[PDB]
Amino acid sequence: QTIQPGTGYNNGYFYSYWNDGHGGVTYTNGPGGQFSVNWSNSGNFVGGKGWQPGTKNKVINFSGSYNPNGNSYLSVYGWSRNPLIEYYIVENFGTYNPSTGATKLGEVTSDGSVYDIYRTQRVNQPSIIGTATFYQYWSVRRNHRSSGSVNTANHFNAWAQQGLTLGTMDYQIVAVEGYFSSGSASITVS
């Protein structure tokens, strides 16, 4: 069903929906691991389905339609504790590459494409544990797609070889993030 920002379990999958309060976004929990997002002249928002907690070797499958009309990303998104890390495995994006201004650490080949690895530090920003300072890890896919399989282990191993030491995995979802744009998406996670 269409819901206001929140988290929980729907049809077997953990979901998380958040928005800055700007308005213009509609999130709907669908059957199985499906969710739909329709936005128009939105603010910043993040919504998706997955697991709570996630694992370090989960192979995530996603399929559906992703039609951004501006700044938006489609990716495997999650958090880690001890160390506190916010991560993104970007599969597709709109008009803005989220790695812009980040520091490139290397590259990794996974699931039919090379990904560029980056890292950034967020100081005194909100997190799953409150206002904190943490690193943000990125894996940006060169060949964009809206359907496929993501072997998370390949990314975590690549990040580890670069100095990342993931600790306790918190939530892990396939999410659509929008940033003051418009668009629509219907993704099914499994």
- Residue 89 to residue 74: CA distance in whole angstroms: 9
Known binder of ligand: residue 17? no
Residue 73 annotated as part of some ligand binding site: yes
Asked about 91 being catalytic, the answer comes back as no
Question: Is the Cβ–Cβ distance between 59 and 110 less than 8 Å?
Answer: no
Does the annotation flag 52 for ligand binding?
no
The verdict on whether 177 is a catalytic residue reads yes
* 122 is known to lie in a ligand binding site: yes
Which residues are 156's β-sheet partners? none
The catalytically annotated residue of 91, 116, 170, 177 is 177
Residue of 17, 35, 86, 152 marked active site: 86
Residue type, 159: W
Question: Has 96 been labeled as part of a binding site?
Answer: no
Q: Which residues contact 152 (CB under 8 A, 6 or more apart)?
A: 54, 55, 56, 57, 58, 59, 60, 76, 89, 172
| Coil vs helix vs strand at 128 | coil
Q: Which of 77, 62, 65 is nearest to 155 (CA)?
A: 77
119 is in an annotated binding site: no
Contacts 24+ apart (CB under 8 A), 98-103: 98/73, 98/138, 98/140, 99/138, 99/140, 102/136, 102/138
136 is in an annotated binding site: yes
Chain-centroid distance, C-alpha 23: 20
Q: Which residues are annotated as a binding site?
A: 73, 77, 88, 122, 126, 136, 171
**Residues with catalytic function:** 86, 177
Residue stretches of the annotated binding site for substrate: 73, 77, 88, 122, 126, 136, 171
